[PDB]
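Cont'd.
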Amino acid sequence: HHSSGREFQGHMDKKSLYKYLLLRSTGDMHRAKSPTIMTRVTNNVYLGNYKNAMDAPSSEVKFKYVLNLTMDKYTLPNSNINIIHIPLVDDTTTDISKYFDDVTAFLSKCDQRNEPVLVHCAAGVNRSGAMILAYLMSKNKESLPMLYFLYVYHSMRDLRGAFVENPSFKRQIIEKYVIDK
Amino acid sequence: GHMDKKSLYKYLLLRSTGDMHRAKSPTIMTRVTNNVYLGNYKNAMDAPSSEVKFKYVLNLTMDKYTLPNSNINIIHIPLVDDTTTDISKYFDDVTAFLSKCDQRNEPVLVHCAAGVNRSGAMILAYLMSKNKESLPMLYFLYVYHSMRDLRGAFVENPSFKRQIIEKYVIDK
Amino acid sequence: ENLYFQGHMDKKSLYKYLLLRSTGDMHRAKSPTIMTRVTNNVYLGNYKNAMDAPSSEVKFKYVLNLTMDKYTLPNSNINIIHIPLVDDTTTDISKYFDDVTAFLSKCDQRNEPVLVHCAAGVNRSGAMILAYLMSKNKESLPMLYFLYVYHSMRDLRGAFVENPSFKRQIIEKYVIDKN
Amino acid sequence: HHSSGREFQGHMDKKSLYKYLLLRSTGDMHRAKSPTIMTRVTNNVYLGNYKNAMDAPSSEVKFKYVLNLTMDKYTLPNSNINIIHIPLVDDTTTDISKYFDDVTAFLSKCDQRNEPVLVHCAAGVNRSGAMILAYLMSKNKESLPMLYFLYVYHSMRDLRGAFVENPSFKRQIIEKYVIDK
Amino acid sequence: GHMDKKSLYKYLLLRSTGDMHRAKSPTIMTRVTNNVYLGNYKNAMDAPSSEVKFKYVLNLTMDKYTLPNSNINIIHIPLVDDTTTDISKYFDDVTAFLSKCDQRNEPVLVHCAAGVNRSGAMILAYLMSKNKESLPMLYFLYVYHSMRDLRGAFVENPSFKRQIIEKYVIDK
Amino acid sequence: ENLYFQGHMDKKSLYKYLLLRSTGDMHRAKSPTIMTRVTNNVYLGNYKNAMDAPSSEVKFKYVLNLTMDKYTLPNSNINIIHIPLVDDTTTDISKYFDDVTAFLSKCDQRNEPVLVHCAAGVNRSGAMILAYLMSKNKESLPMLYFLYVYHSMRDLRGAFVENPSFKRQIIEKYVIDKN
Amino acid sequence: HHSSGREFQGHMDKKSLYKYLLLRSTGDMHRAKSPTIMTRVTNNVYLGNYKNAMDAPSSEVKFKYVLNLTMDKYTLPNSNINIIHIPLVDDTTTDISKYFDDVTAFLSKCDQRNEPVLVHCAAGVNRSGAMILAYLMSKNKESLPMLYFLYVYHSMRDLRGAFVENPSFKRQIIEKYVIDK
Amino acid sequence: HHHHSSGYFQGHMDKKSLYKYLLLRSTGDMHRAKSPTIMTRVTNNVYLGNYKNAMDAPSSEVKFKYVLNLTMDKYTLPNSNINIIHIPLVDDTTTDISKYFDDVTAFLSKCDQRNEPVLVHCAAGVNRSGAMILAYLMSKNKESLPMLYFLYVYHSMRDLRGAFVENPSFKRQIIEKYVID
Amino acid sequence: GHMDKKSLYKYLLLRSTGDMHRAKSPTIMTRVTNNVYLGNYKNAMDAPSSEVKFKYVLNLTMDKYTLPNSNINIIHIPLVDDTTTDISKYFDDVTAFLSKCDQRNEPVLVHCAAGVNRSGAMILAYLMSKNKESLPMLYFLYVYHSMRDLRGAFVENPSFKRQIIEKYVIDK
Amino acid sequence: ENLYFQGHMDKKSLYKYLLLRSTGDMHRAKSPTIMTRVTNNVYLGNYKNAMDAPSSEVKFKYVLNLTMDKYTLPNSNINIIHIPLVDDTTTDISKYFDDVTAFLSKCDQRNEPVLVHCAAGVNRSGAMILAYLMSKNKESLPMLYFLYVYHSMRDLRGAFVENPSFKRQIIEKYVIDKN
Amino acid sequence: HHHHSSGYFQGHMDKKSLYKYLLLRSTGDMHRAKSPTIMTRVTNNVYLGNYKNAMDAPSSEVKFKYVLNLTMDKYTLPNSNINIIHIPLVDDTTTDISKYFDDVTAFLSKCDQRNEPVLVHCAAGVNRSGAMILAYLMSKNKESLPMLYFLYVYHSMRDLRGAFVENPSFKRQIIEKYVID
């Protein structure tokens, strides 16, 4: 009886929610699959891949910003979209924690001002996923929000097919947003 | 289970978001409580000659067997390890039995073929039954993952986990 | 064994044996402990035998696991095949006969030792072994051979295919429909 | 949830026990099958067949006595085992009740002194079974111990495969140990 | 059931340790109570022309039928006679119905094909329901064996006996 | 009956009959009481007919019991065969067709009267009888024959294979796949 | 647990009765099938078809009356049965309500005097069914007896295979015996 | 695997599926009758319907030139061009309709050649109108043997509409005219 | 449901004695309550672009699907439409959910493939749950037939009707 | 599609594609919305596509409904075939393969457009379409063809026979047992 | 019926079972990735492992002469004879590893001839090390067609270890080098 959606939950059937989370949390998870379409995670913040960035100009959503987290700069030919390049490496040795506060603050601004922004990397899973996950966690105000983290993580992973599979990225999100804050 | 919170919560969270090792078959018996052991079919055959003086072995495979030279009492509950079989119908009787064994200090091996799914579920049910909290989600994840880390594989069968969750976490 | 001597060992001793054994003079089932070599390369055993396969003197190439539980043997270079079977009186096992006997047969052709087991090594694995033995027989209605193989094997191991549904299916497949 | 063993029961799951007994008692019993190995029924008293008697010398159990209930005397070549011959006929016309008090008293002595004794007949089912059954009943102290009789009977029959199938023997055990005492 | 104890207890004990006659198919109807009869399919067909004036026949075979010239009311509950079928789900309704028949003095034949297993179980359930003791094991064995001796065959199906035991002896 | 006259009795009366009977002008089911002789030696009846077989004028050699209940006939010298069948819309009965028709056929060859019955003598036994009748037909797509046999038989007995799943299986086996 | 019979019900298992009625009442009804034998609906009143009328002389029931509701007069050769002809048309335009009071009163008389009467039309379903249904309703005394109507209707239809399928006949019975009275 | 519409799919479709369907239909696996609601286009120009359908004919997408009224009552259609032929029939088992066949089928036949839409109706759209349509369909039969075609048409038409010449007398007359003849 | 009695009772009685139209597949969505709609699979696909602003769609087909550009939450309960499947096990959860939707004024489409059997049963269960009478037989027939007349086909599956009757009419 | 160019389009691009797609580089399942024309006359779609069939530009003669729900299309002159199938991992669908492919094949022979659908148009209908495509292949062990058809079709529709049991049955029927 | 170890069982085993397994594996019936724990003997002398495995190499039963370290960090092994070759690689989708293939496979090839045990590892033992081992295994391929061998090796290796060159860029490079080429 779980409600798969787009973007509350303190009112959906609790036994259903808990069963879902606990099953996902003990090894009952789908194999990773690449996302294809953008996901609107907030009123204004979208998560996507490289292809989604190429199609952004002709999207019904009137994007003002694109955060490019890949290593490669590109331009968008007939568009007034501002493309901001924050190049990141997708591996288990890089610190992304230093980016969190700046990126969530920016996205937060995009929502205040109702200016749609697409955050994407190449496959739309780790670099961009982590920024989006950071953003969602930043909005939470509890002291040890473990449930909320699991709920967001799994429900976002089921929706997209793959979501912050990078264990080092997940670790960093946990330290920043769940463990100590 | 009241340790260093931050480390614990970190471990659980990583474990719960997909950071799991590939299943390894256990070989040795694990002592889960004072009297209750978890093991595989070989552990069962080795029971009579073990330092531990078992009075009981609980066989969850589909096969009857005897241990002629021992004085062990064998209880047989043939269970199917698949995803459509109901095992919850046995939880109360098995946890009451295992609970009797711990009260009377009477050592008991619970086992199946590989000592992972049927026997593991019964062990998990047992540990969950000893918990008096109203919504023991952390304790469930904690027990589940620490057991899996200790043994190498533990209740890999999702249907079995679902049944435990239904009985012991989300009804309660 | 001594199936080669069917038509040929002492008939009075043999028929007294098959006939008493066939009219209700059978011993109470006893769990096996040791592997039995049924063929040049095919062995029948229980789950403990399976755990001990790596360090056995026989150089196993294959293990056929007929329990419901998957396992691995890390240190060994043994290949493990898993066919999870139910031991009850309703499941159909005959659908695996051809594939399994063909496979066991191939292990014999290539001299690649294989251990076939379930949990106790009586019913699921017993049935596959019985299927294999029967598939080697070429006669038309091999009643004598079936009775001999079943009872010898049961005397030797202590218990062998006690499941009546498994026996029925083996009879249907290998003794009653041939030519 | 019934615990099949070797040799208590006023503590095993009662509903399990009762269901088992009542099913066995209303016709749900295995066909008789010959025993093969000895059964240790007590700390010191074993039940076995002729073959078991032949192997007694080389058993890990250090037997002092063997009760031979067959019609035929035998010796055991390289052994100091005392073989006592009480020849009995296994049919429905012979009185074995006259043997009960003497045989249980002897076995009882064997247990007091920790001197293992094997009681056997040819197949290890009726003559020897009845003596063993008498012995077990003799240890019970209730006034009409019907449950205990059924429990011992069936659980011993399931263990061995066949146990006092001789209805005349059973009748005699009932009169002596259950009905009037 | 308060007779000569020693003889009774002797008979039960012999009966319970394997002294049973080979099953014979019954032919005639047995009156189990004041109004409740047990019988086979022929007894059912002969019901209308019987000295007894049945108002009801309870058909436990898998086949519908009618009795055109009679004024009997036929109730049909198709049951499977095998070892995996649940018949307990019908006990309460059937014993309540049979109980109504005895209160209103309204004769009723319960039958199946041979009048041994499905009909027999319902009769056994009925007799057990009238018993108010907490653990009626003796009464169960007594009824079971005396019925089998009277009819020649009675609830030979072990699964059916198991279900009766569970409902009426070991829960209670 | 009169299946020998299929191609040959009055067509106007026959087609009016089959056609009305086939478009919903059928009588309400009525339980049979008496045996019907369907063949030289094969009879269809209910459980009471079975109990009366020993003392019938026809010298029965066999009784085929298709109920779920075993019985014996002590005084008689009749042989009883028991195939316990379920009367529902899901069980497969087609797996027994060949064996049962072969057997009934043999009783006819050897003139050994046999009674086939279930409880009421409509569905389980009806289906086996219908299978047997159809197995005797040699034509390619014997629709006319099937309809005639079904309805005549139902008119004669009051009720005959009312189970639609049984009819379907008989159609599948004997009318639609032939040559 | 429903008791299919011949001709009470304020004592049969209520949950069984209700489940049956409600299922029949929401579209779970057998296809219509012709009746063959007469049905004794009362101590003395029978419902039948044309064939049943032809066999009435040789019936074990000693009929005094036959109500012929077909359009065709017939005689019964070697019989003292009084055949009363009330010809009716079986369609959706004919008023049968004018017949009700007279026909139930007559049948009622036949029961008082214990004189068996057979009411029949051609197929024994609509013309005769409606008269019988009227008769049964006339005996009921409640103010809005909807349950009783459904019970009689369905249980009579299941017994006979077809029973007042004519919707116009049913309508007329409803107005007279259930709606306003 | 059999296919349902109107509009031959017969000497064309899978024969096994066909025979299976017919044989099941013919040996009593038929739905209980339910009343038709919408019109059925039986042919290029010929439609089958009920009273309500007839009233709605002017408002239809179909440009009807004729409506064939088989009810007892003459009616007019307010302001519509449609020509309302009236041929009153009785829906019972005593009336000859066969005498109307040739004329009605010839008329229908004419409507199909000159492509002039026609609605054949009675009150409920089941018997009277159904019978004329069935006769029409048999009159057009030139490829397949009448017996099989009769069943095929009868059952597929009944499955489509819910009820179709349920009147056994009407079915008989059609059989005598088109199958026996 | 307190209208002109005689007309109502007449309609029910005719409806209940076999005067029913042949089933028609519905095409448009039906608003059953303030927030709860009933529909088919196309209605589901058209949900995002509908005047009604659904927050929820309850999919009772056996097929998962997504509605990418919408903000609708999809709940999937795969049900079998046959006569042996138990759907009662879902009644309480589904009616509690639908009840939540009506309390919070949150529009919800319940649908299956054709919008007749699985979705219809859930709707029927919902409407029955809002009724507080002890034996609501009239209300059951009334709702059943008026719905079927409105939609053209509604819970044609007799097993589904049986389960609703058991849950909501004859236990209660 | 472009199965005609199997042996023949650029191998480097093709094998990179099949090989990445076959070792776990597949996109997350996405529900289709539009019909896909798989053949001259055979279309694959979902339930909404079915409701829109009458007013489609393609002149459909048949619709094959594989959901559990019967429906009608009153205004249309389309013929509807209903095979209610379960979408789970235990039901057998292989028993319908021959009949359905034979039927789809016939629609192609006669140029009679047919739409095959279930609810979402992924699994039940997908499998029948996959069966049909595979039945057209004549090679001995058409692995390349199977992989190409499966992945192209899945890329084109967004999701295609995600049910692993359905895929298994298609593999068993059309790729592993041939000649 | 397919068989799992390491150590050809391919142009040898049941082909139907083989194709069935591969085809299922290839069309999405794959397990979610899980991290390897113990080493895998891929060949007579060549082993695949992770960091932890590398530290435990001195304490192993296997007498290792070489360990191939593909992590960014140089390390030493306290007092062990093993020669630690270091070739640092980045685990992402932008890095060329193909330029290392020939040298790494030639080195591995050398180790198998001179029977000198070797452990190829990276941090988690999945991508970098997996890719070199896969390349090695393709380099040795002389009997079966590369396409089928690639899949067979990929899936059986992944089933054994739990995860194996999950990096799509690394898989691509291997395909270009060993299958297309």
